[PDB]
Design a protein around this ligand. Structure first.
Ligand SMILES: Cc1ncc(COP(=O)(O)O)c(C/N=C(\C=C\OCCN)C(=O)O)c1O
Ligand SMILES: Cc1ncc(COP(=O)(O)O)c(C/N=C(\C=C\OCCN)C(=O)O)c1O
Lengths: 424, 424
């Protein structure tokens, strides 16, 4: 009797790309990848740093080999130097408006591991967490698969730019009741995937007030925090906790947590560097013990400790990343406009939330899937349909702009315009 | 309401060492670490290889930089070249008597992650797995904490060298019944931690016959497979499946699995390289998706793919590791003999299972703890008491011999003899 745990367009389109991937030389007619949120815009900056500072990657420290020491380093508290470099980098991303205690930071194998661990720590099987829609498709697996925890949506609509409202929060909490589920917290993504927008101060205060009243937790996945390239300003959930008489007052501050990773800003998803940050000593202790199942390679911790300790590098990287991200997003927005397609006004992330409602046969998700399939097979472009992100409104699509060359992006825009000018 | 999951001498003695660690220059009277199974005997061989082949660590392949490619590599199927190097290395460890399909190998962040994942895949919360005692203390957390699975012991005694017997298996299966638990499989460690012995062909056939009759799974944690330094020969569970009319016959072959890691033979625990191997396509698929929570750093996968692809290195490493391990084990055995202390005749691992029953005040675990504490505070040596490994017989201790300099081992033996010659 095989177990239970051992026994979706987002993953579908991805596989379709694998079958016939685009190549500017071999398969110039293949499918162009615009459905995965990755950042290939600044590798030259990191490659340059590595060329000038070869010691870290060589298992050398102060001209001394520390291969053996690192090979043996498996402490679940993480490499001291790396934890310090990380909290400093997290502070810098936030304009030094907030500071993080390295003893309250827990390293994990990517945010994928961090989010699951947070759920294991805050909710028991059969309980639930509330999540604003639309949200990252991966959460359906990360937060529920091995945890036995359920997701209850906090529906957001285009009427107000997909922002969280009081009514949406209570409606979600009430649906949790109808489903006989006990709510343990709210998990938000700030900046938002797939919206490409930074959370507003208003939304943050609304969330804090809500979790305070309900006596639950607030987890903020801020993996895109370093990718805010245009106004308005990114506001970490930890900044709102600063001045509000909650530093050492109230008790809600103990229930606010952050998830981070180096996958999206630095473009290092393969290195699996994730992190959990909590003000609650017990959560930190539990998460630390849990990190045993997904520790970060000491080889990687050492390399990045050296990299992130270079203040000239971090400063220039964030600045250039913002510059290149803004330029690329503008190119996508401009390219889509030429096809009469608009986007939700965004300012962060590695993608745009695109409005293709006017291209639907009808206002239904069935019509959305029809359009999606047509874009995949006829236009040969892989983008994500809003339904994969649980958007309540048919017609929205997530289009990633930083995981391919600029020229390939232009090609994608050309092929899309030919498509719209052909049928509509 | 904080969750449940978020809310032992093995870990105790370890912490006591941290408080007052030994140092041949600064704290020559501190506690000597002999309670953790790590291998510091062959780093010079790896350091030498790295000095001669600097490209892998430099993110270079054929003189070309592949930093960006590796930075972006996060595929849960693992790096092709590394998977191939791993299956080849696993075959070599087994004298090429068995071959492994890389498509059936799943990389994980250490065997800690591999074992937990196997449990998630084969058992539901509330069910159980049988484990021969004594066993690795870490299993009490790895196999049960987040899985909700229980452990039912298969008691082994010194009467026959702590080998598994038919009677012990049925008694375990029956106890599972008394506890109202459904047994899903048996997890063994071969070579054994803490026994330091290789499983016999007899035991292997007994286990296979048992899981066949019960219709359950057999998981063999062979993390110590490359550390068999003396007769008898190590026999992988996969070898016994070779010739027995089960290659394509019977169905038990589909329920036999292996866990491996590079933590103990190569001494790379900090790099977190673990692996799951299964003949069942569905288990592989499930474990692959689960590895998302604990992927191996691509930086590390690349480095070791190059290292393990060097057949001259792997051959010389295994040979030298065996040589040095045997020499060190003999030194511990010889040192203990001078204090009138004998060990279970072992031939593998990084530790010896020591018989100190004659040093107990009485045949009780209470007496065992008394002796243990005396060795920690009076002798200033950290070793693990058998009860931490769930041994049914009081008086046995696990003593690790490869995680310190030879001279420090001798010092430990000197201090131990003074102890026994003082009270007994
Ligand atoms: C909000 C959010 N949290 C966590 C993660 C996981 O990141 P980690 O730190 O584990 O690497 C992602 C990755 N997002 C995507 C994942 C893509 O992976 C597929 C291959 N490119 C995505 O396309 O939105 C994310 O968007
Ligand atoms: C049978 C067995 N399986 C799995 C593991 C986990 O290894 P991984 O591949 O995750 O690194 C161990 C580590 N064994 C010990 C762990 C020690 O860690 C403590 C710090 N040295 C031990 O002392 O017996 C082990 O002995």
């Amino acid at each position: 009797m095989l177990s239970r745990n051992a026994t979706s367009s987002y993953f579908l389109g991805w596989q379709e790309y694998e079958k016939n991937p685009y190549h500017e030389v071999h398969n110039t007619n293949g499918i162009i990848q615009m459905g995965l949120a990755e950042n290939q815009l600044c590798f030259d900056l990191l490659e340059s740093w590595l060329a000038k500072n070869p010691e870290a990657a060589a298992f050398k420290k102060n001209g001394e080999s520390i291969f053996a020491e690192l090979a043996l380093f498996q402490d679940y508290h993480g490499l001291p130097a790396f934890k310090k470099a990380m909290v400093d980098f997290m502070a810098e991303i936030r304009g030094n408006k907030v500071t993080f205690d390295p003893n309250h930071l827990v390293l994990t194998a990517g945010a994928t591991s961090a989010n699951e661990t947070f759920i294991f720590c805050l909710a028991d099987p059969g309980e639930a967490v509330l999540i604003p829609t639309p949200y990252y498709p991966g959460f359906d697996r990360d937060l529920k698969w091995r945890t036995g925890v359920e997701i209850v949506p906090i529906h957001c609509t285009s009427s107000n730019g997909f922002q969280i409202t009081e009514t949406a929060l209570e409606e979600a909490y009430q649906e949790a009741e109808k489903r006989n589920l006990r709510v343990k917290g709210v998990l938000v993504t700030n900046p938002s995937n797939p919206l490409g927008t930074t959370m507003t101060r208003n939304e943050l205060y609304l969330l804090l007030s809500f979790v305070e009243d309900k006596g639950i937790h607030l987890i903020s996945d801020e993996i895109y925090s370093g990718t805010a390239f245009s106004s308005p300003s990114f506001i970490s959930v930890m900044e709102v906790l600063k001045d509000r008489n909650c530093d050492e007052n109230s008790e809600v501050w103990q229930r606010v947590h952050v998830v981070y990773s180096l996958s999206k800003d630095l473009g290092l998803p393969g290195f699996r560097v994730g992190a959990i940050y909590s003000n609650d000593d017990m959560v930190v202790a539990a998460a630390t013990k849990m990190s045993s199942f997904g520790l970060v390679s000491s080889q990687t911790q050492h390399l990045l400790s050296a990299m992130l300790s270079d203040k000239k590098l971090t400063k220039n990287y964030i600045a250039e990343n913002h510059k290149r991200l803004k330029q690329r997003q503008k190119k996508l927005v401009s390219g889509l406009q030429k096809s009469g397609i608009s986007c939700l006004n965004g300012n962060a992330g590695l993608f745009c939330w695109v409005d293709m409602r006017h291209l639907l046969r009808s206002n239904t998700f069935e019509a959305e899937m029809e359009l999606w399939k047509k874009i995949v097979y006829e236009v040969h472009l892989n983008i994500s349909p809003g339904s994969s992100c649980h958007c309540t409104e048919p017609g929205w699509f997530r289009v990633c702009f930083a995981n391919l060359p600029e020229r390939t992006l232009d090609l994608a825009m050309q092929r899309l315009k030919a498509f719209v000018g052909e049928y509509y």
